[PDB]
Scaffold this motif. Structure first.
Motif, short mmCIF file in Angstrom:
data_model
loop_
_atom_site.label_atom_id
_atom_site.label_comp_id
_atom_site.label_asym_id
_atom_site.label_seq_id
_atom_site.Cartn_x
_atom_site.Cartn_y
_atom_site.Cartn_z
N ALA A 1 6.05 5.02 1.88
CA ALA A 1 7.20 5.05 0.98
C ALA A 1 8.49 4.78 1.76
O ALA A 1 9.40 5.59 1.80
CB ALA A 1 7.27 6.38 0.24
N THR B 1 6.28 9.25 3.10
CA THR B 1 5.16 9.08 2.18
C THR B 1 5.46 9.79 0.86
O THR B 1 6.18 10.78 0.82
CB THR B 1 3.85 9.62 2.76
OG1 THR B 1 3.88 11.06 2.76
CG2 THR B 1 3.64 9.12 4.17
N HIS C 1 2.49 1.30 -11.73
CA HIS C 1 2.50 0.72 -10.40
C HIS C 1 1.43 -0.36 -10.29
O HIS C 1 0.43 -0.35 -11.01
CB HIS C 1 2.30 1.78 -9.33
CG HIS C 1 3.50 2.66 -9.13
ND1 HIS C 1 3.62 3.52 -8.06
CD2 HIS C 1 4.63 2.80 -9.85
CE1 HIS C 1 4.78 4.15 -8.13
NE2 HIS C 1 5.41 3.73 -9.21
N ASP D 1 2.60 15.59 1.51
CA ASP D 1 3.19 14.33 1.93
C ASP D 1 4.08 14.54 3.15
O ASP D 1 4.68 15.60 3.33
CB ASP D 1 4.01 13.71 0.80
CG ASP D 1 3.17 12.88 -0.14
OD1 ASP D 1 2.45 11.98 0.34
OD2 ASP D 1 3.24 13.11 -1.37
N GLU E 1 -0.74 0.78 1.57
CA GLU E 1 0.12 1.94 1.77
C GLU E 1 -0.70 3.21 1.82
O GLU E 1 -0.36 4.15 2.55
CB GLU E 1 1.16 2.03 0.65
CG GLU E 1 2.04 0.80 0.49
CD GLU E 1 1.37 -0.30 -0.30
OE1 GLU E 1 0.22 -0.11 -0.74
OE2 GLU E 1 1.98 -1.38 -0.47
N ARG E 2 -1.84 3.23 1.12
CA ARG E 2 -2.73 4.39 1.16
C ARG E 2 -3.35 4.54 2.53
O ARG E 2 -3.36 5.63 3.11
CB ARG E 2 -3.82 4.22 0.11
CG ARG E 2 -3.36 3.64 -1.20
CD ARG E 2 -4.52 3.49 -2.14
NE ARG E 2 -5.52 2.56 -1.62
CZ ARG E 2 -6.70 2.35 -2.17
NH1 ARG E 2 -7.04 2.90 -3.32
NH2 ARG E 2 -7.56 1.53 -1.56
N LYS F 1 7.59 5.77 -3.98
CA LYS F 1 6.53 4.77 -3.96
C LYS F 1 6.99 3.44 -4.53
O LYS F 1 7.74 3.38 -5.51
CB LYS F 1 5.31 5.26 -4.74
CG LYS F 1 4.53 6.35 -4.04
CD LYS F 1 3.62 7.08 -4.99
CE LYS F 1 2.71 6.12 -5.73
NZ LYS F 1 1.68 6.83 -6.51
N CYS F 2 6.54 2.36 -3.90
CA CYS F 2 6.85 1.02 -4.37
C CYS F 2 6.09 0.69 -5.64
O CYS F 2 4.91 1.01 -5.78
CB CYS F 2 6.51 -0.01 -3.29
SG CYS F 2 4.85 0.15 -2.61
N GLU G 1 1.00 7.58 -0.25
CA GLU G 1 1.28 6.18 0.00
C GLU G 1 2.53 6.06 0.86
O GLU G 1 3.46 6.85 0.72
CB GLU G 1 1.46 5.39 -1.30
CG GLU G 1 0.20 5.27 -2.12
CD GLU G 1 0.35 4.32 -3.29
OE1 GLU G 1 0.66 3.13 -3.06
OE2 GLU G 1 0.14 4.75 -4.44
N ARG H 1 -0.91 -2.75 -7.41
CA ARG H 1 -1.44 -2.85 -6.05
C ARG H 1 -2.20 -4.17 -5.94
O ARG H 1 -3.42 -4.22 -6.08
CB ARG H 1 -2.30 -1.64 -5.74
CG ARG H 1 -1.49 -0.36 -5.73
CD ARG H 1 -0.45 -0.41 -4.62
NE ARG H 1 0.39 0.77 -4.54
CZ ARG H 1 1.62 0.86 -5.04
NH1 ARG H 1 2.12 -0.08 -5.82
NH2 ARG H 1 2.34 1.95 -4.79
#
Lengths: 114, 91, 789, 32, 49
Positions: free
Chosen positions: C541, C535, C654, C531, C471-472, C463-464, C539, C656
């Motif tokens: 990825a 992902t 993280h 996932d 991304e979700r 994940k970033c 999210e 967002r």
């Protein structure tokens, strides 16, 4: 068939009087949400998770106090998010909880107090 | 020759058929002969301009690795990969 | 309204419309079929149309190389004679390809997606040619009709370049007399001086203010009369010209309308197949209802030729979870762009966007989100500002930038009708995945979109640290994660399957992924179970958070070349799997990487960990970008992404960041970044992370020397994505002959592949009955030697 | 980090149904 | 129009109006005395330059 997205069932006040008067096998959780209320977005998700976790071992239902405001007042509700836990044994006193109680407190009440 | 035309084959077939039909009507036993002469003219003209639609070959047939910047090269040098050089220089 | 729509919903609601009406609509146009002797009759009883489910499931159709399709049956009457010579058999009309829920059709084993088409909207339009007032009806079949004035009115309707007739003559041919013209036009003595589909009907009524009932789906003569009256209006200037290129004058045809058209073609073929088989039945007698006088060929092969050949049916770009979504939201003028995140195709083929409505005191609206097309949304004052301004006056009189007609202007809130509340409203999916996008030159917004659409899914996706929150949505709507189909407690989880039990019923969900649920978890209906590729945690990825410095090294990062540490090879950080058998493709020199900001680069050098620059915490940096790219492509947002990514690495946070956070506050993004850098510093006691003298930069050291570079280097942990991976031209001939280097030119044009191509040239001219004859003259003997040609 | 997105949260659309399940539910497609 | 009036007919025909150039030049029996570059690369020559 497409499976319905929500398990917590909305009742009218009369359908709730019916459900409380009739004999119950399982704890009845009544949520007095209202749709304008911020915490009720969160409580509705907690109750949906509870309603999955208990499957048929609990009857979790909700009563919109926009519709049943006088019934909420007669239930002595003094705010939202509020929740009643009504035992299947009709002798026991029901438990009212106020605020976003943890889902673990819901489990505690249902397993140990109902 | 067919090796230079392995759409114009339909035009050659049409011309061949029209010409052979015209010969047959000339020889087997006049306004229908004239009609076939007309349709031969039309077929040939369509085939010439077609060759004109093929005429472009001057550009199509007469004319006509990712790089990495390397500081370690000299201004007159380039780095030629093994996997390419073994093909380039094979002879 | 309340939330970002499902990205595939545009396809979904299109396909359901095709099922909900397009079948009835197209089957209703199937005529009665009559034999040549006018004695035998066939018809489909459309009321009996019945789609039976695909007897083969998707994962079997894709494996067997088949089309995943439902079967249409209809009962068919056939009177072979009078009285009881009737059969009414239920007959199989054919396979229609069904859509899978993420928006694709499996056709002969290959996932296809129907690209949306943009067309000129039906209606009426006025062009000022050169003044030559020129009206034009566009019917929804694409048929033009033209009207014109050049001088002194005398309006001509135009049919062809040699065919023009005065509109009173056309109306006389349509059976309307001068008395009807006089009654039904506003300027009747001007006229006397001369002596479409549902969308089309709507748009002509709207543009002419006419009130013809919708059931008059075709053009009426009074429509042409009104068009001429409005053309006289334009001549006087009582109107406006229409700009055809503007997005307001476009319509979108979805999967629904193309599939419905292809059903129209398939049924017209069925009509010819019934007529020809009734012929064989009326000449060879044969057998009644063998199934019936119907074959499966028309529908099945019509749809399969549509998918195989039509330019708007394209193989699904399964490269990564983002491209699987974005492909089904392309918008092509052929038969390009992509639909904005919140855009919805309305019931009239217009593209509608949601706007909050500021109705103030009078009305009691329930839902205050309108959806408006670019045709409507110009007649409203849209504001994009905020109510966060106050003065010794009042909030109502506080002015904001708004949009009205096509203009931008400044107006009081009292004047504003609508607010564009959603951040992502105008962005495509790819643009919405870029954080701090308002700090990147919009020119590169397309490029930085394309970069993410080239990103290879990585083994051990990640994940970033910094994102936008889409991304979700992308993970959810890509269908690469296993979303639960049914609530329940988890029973079992491995690499092959997940098992649920709920409503006292079990469900088994095989994985074609890694399980995110613990074996004891409980799941609500639409939550993630596993996932997918590229992902993590539900999210998107696509990349990895690589510790990076931006400084010019010794040319190996010249003009956006990139150095990487050997650790990127050690850690499998950019190891992909490519399937043919698979190969464990590592990152290599000459591989392409990009940040999400359009900061692409090519790996030129791989240095061992101790040769890299290293930070004041001793960590070597893992890539060295070059900073001359930052003003070259004008992307300051990536420096924020760098700095805040570092903060996120140190705080274990993280982020967002929805776009345009500067709407809250000026410098809002700088304030977020510097605040979280300072928190990461003081929490970790890394004072080099936020050096107050030059925040976000730090002094860093040469791993080959240990001395610091004397100026601070910008450092970050940005999110980097690995991207996916002889004609002798006339301008090269011109260049070589410019150098006079003509023996190389001869080599390149002859023996490297008279020359045989000149033999071809002369032979084809000789086949045109022209003798291209080549001679050369002996200098010694004047002999005319004919060349070999 | 390691947060898993609750796709049932209040900022997601209602779970999209399986296209066959939806068509069957709406009695548009039949099984037998 | 300076091309298509350049005496080496191949430099005209290989530029534009190829059929019209060739038709006129064949009726004219025209001689392209091969000089200049464009008309020499078609014949695969050593380039008169």
């Amino acid at each position: 068939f497409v499976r319905e997205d929500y398990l917590v069932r909305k009742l009218t006040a009369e359908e709730l009087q019916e459900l409380v008067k009739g004999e119950r096998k399982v704890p009845l959780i009544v949520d007095f949400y209202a749709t304008w209320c911020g915490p009720c977005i969160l409580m509705a998700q907690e109750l949906e998770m509870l309603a999955v976790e208990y499957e048929s071992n609990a009857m979790i239902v909700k009563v919109d106090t926009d519709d049943e405001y006088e019934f909420a007042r007669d239930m002595q509700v003094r705010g939202l998010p509020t929740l009643f836990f009504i035992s299947p044994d009709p002798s026991k006193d029901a438990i009212r909880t106020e605020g976003l109680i943890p889902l673990q407190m819901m489990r505690d009440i249902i397993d140990n107090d109902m | 020759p067919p090796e230079l035309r392995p759409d114009i084959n339909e035009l050659y077939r049409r011309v061949i058929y029209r010409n052979n039909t015209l010969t047959d009507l000339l020889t087997t036993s006049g306004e229908l002969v004239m009609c076939q002469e007309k349709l031969v003219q039309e077929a040939v003209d369509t085939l010439l301009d077609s060759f004109s639609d093929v005429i472009g070959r001057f550009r199509e047939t007469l004319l006509g690795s990712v790089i990495v910047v390397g500081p370690s090269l000299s201004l007159h040098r380039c780095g030629l990969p093994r996997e390419i050089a073994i093909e380039l220089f094979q002879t | 309204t309340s939330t970002i729509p499902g990205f595939n919903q545009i396809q979904f609601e299109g396909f359901y419309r095709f099922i909900d009406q397009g079948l009835i609509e197209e089957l209703s146009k199937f005529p009665k079929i009559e034999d040549i002797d006018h004695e035998i009759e066939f018809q489909l009883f459309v009321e009996t149309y019945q789609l039976v489910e695909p007897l083969i499931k998707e994962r079997d159709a894709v494996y067997e190389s088949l089309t995943y399709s439902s079967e249409l049956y209809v009962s068919a009457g056939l009177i072979w004679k009078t009285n009881r010579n009737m059969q009414e058999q239920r007959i199989f009309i054919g396979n229609i390809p069904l859509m899978n829920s993420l928006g694709t059709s499996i056709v002969n084993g290959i996932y296809r997606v129907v690209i949306n088409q943009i067309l000129q909207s039906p209606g009426i339009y006025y062009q000022s040619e050169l003044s030559v007032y020129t009206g034009t009806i566009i019917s929804d079949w694409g048929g033009r009709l033209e009207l014109e004035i050049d001088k002194k009115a005398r309006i001509w309707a135009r049919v062809s370049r040699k065919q023009k007739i005065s509109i009173l003559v056309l109306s006389s041919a349509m059976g309307s007399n001068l008395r009807e013209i006089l009654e039904n036009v506003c300027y009747p003595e001007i006229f006397l001086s001369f002596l479409l589909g549902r969308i089309g009907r709507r748009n002509i009524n709207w543009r002419l203010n006419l009130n013809i009932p919708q059931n008059n789906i075709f053009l009426l003569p009074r429509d042409i009369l009104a068009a001429a009256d409005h053309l006289i209006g334009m001549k006087f200037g009582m109107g406006t010209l229409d700009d055809m290129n503007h997005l307001k004058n476009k319509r979108i045809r979805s999967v629904a309308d193309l599939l419905q058209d292809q059903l129209g073609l398939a049924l017209a073929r069925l009509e010819n197949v019934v007529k020809g088989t009734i012929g064989g039945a009326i000449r060879h007698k044969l057998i009644p209802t063998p199934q019936n006088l119907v074959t499966s060929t028309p529908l099945t092969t019509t749809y399969e030729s549509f998918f195989g050949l039509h330019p708007l049916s394209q193989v699904l770009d399964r490269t990564n979870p983002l491209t699987q979504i974005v492909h089904g939201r392309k918008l092509s003028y052929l038969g390009i762009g992509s639909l904005s995140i919140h855009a919805r195709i309305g019931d009239w083929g217009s593209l509608e966007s949601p706007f909050y409505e500021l109705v103030e005191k009078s009305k009691k609206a329930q839902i205050r989100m309108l959806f408006l097309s670019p045709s409507q949304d110009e007649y409203y004052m849209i504001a994009a500002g905020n109510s966060l301004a106050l003065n010794r006056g009042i909030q109502e009189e506080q002015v904001v930038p708004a949009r009205y007609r096509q203009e931008f202007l400044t107006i009081a809130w009292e004047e504003v009708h609508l607010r564009s509340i959603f951040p992502f409203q105008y962005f495509s999916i790819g643009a919405s995945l870029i954080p701090f996008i308002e700090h990147n030159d919009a020119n590169r917004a397309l490029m930085s979109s394309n970069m993410q659409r080239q990103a290879v899914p990585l083994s051990r996706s990640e994940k970033c640290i910094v994102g936008t929150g889409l991304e979700r949505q992308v993970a959810l709507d890509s269908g690469v994660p296993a979303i639960a189909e049914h609530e329940g407690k988890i029973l079992y989880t491995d690499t092959e399957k997940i098992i649920l039990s709920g409503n006292e019923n079990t469900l088994s969900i095989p994985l074609i992924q890694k399980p995110q649920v613990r074996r004891g978890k409980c799941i609500k209906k639409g939550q993630i179970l596993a996932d997918g590729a590229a992902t993590v945690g539900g999210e998107l990825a696509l990349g990895k958070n690589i510790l990076v410095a931006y400084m010019p090294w010794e040319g190996y990062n010249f003009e956006d070349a990139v150095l990487i540490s050997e650790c990127l090879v050690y850690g499998d950080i950019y190891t992909s799997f490519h399937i043919r058998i698979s190969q464990k493709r590592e990152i290599k020199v000459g591989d392409k990487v990009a940040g999400r900001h359009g900061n692409k680069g090519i790996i030129s050098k791989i240095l061992p960990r101790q040769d890299m620059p290293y930070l004041q915490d001793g960590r070597p940096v893992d890539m060295v970008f070059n900073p001359l790219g930052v003003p070259s492509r004008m992307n300051v947002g990536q420096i924020f992404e760098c700095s805040l990514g570092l903060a996120g690495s140190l705080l274990d946070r993280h982020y967002r960041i929805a776009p345009f956070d500067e709407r809250y506050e000026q410098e809002a993004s700088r304030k977020l970044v510097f605040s979280e850098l300072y928190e990461a510093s003081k929490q970790t006691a890394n004072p080099w992370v936020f050096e107050p003298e030059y925040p976000g930069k730090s002094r860093i050291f040469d791993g080959r020397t240990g001395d610091p570079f004397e100026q601070p280097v910008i450092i970050g942990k940005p999110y980097i994505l690995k991207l996916i991976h002889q004609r002798v031209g006339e301008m090269e001939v011109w260049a070589l002959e410019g150098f006079g280097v003509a023996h190389i030119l001869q080599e390149m044009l002859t023996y490297k592949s008279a020359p045989e191509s000149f033999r071809l040239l002369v032979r084809e001219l000789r086949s045109l009955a022209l003798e291209l004859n080549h001679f050369l003259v002996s200098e010694k003997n004047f002999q005319i030697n004919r060349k070999e040609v | 980090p390691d947060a898993v997105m609750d796709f049932r949260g209040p900022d997601f659309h209602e779970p999209t149904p399986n296209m066959l399940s939806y068509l069957k539910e709406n009695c548009k497609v039949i099984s037998r | 129009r300076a091309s298509l009036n350049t005496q080496s007919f191949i430099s005209e025909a290989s530029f534009q109006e190829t059929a019209r150039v060739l038709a006129k030049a064949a009726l004219r029996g025209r001689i392209d005395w091969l000089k200049g570059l464009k008309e020499n690369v078609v014949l695969g020559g050593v380039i008169p330059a």
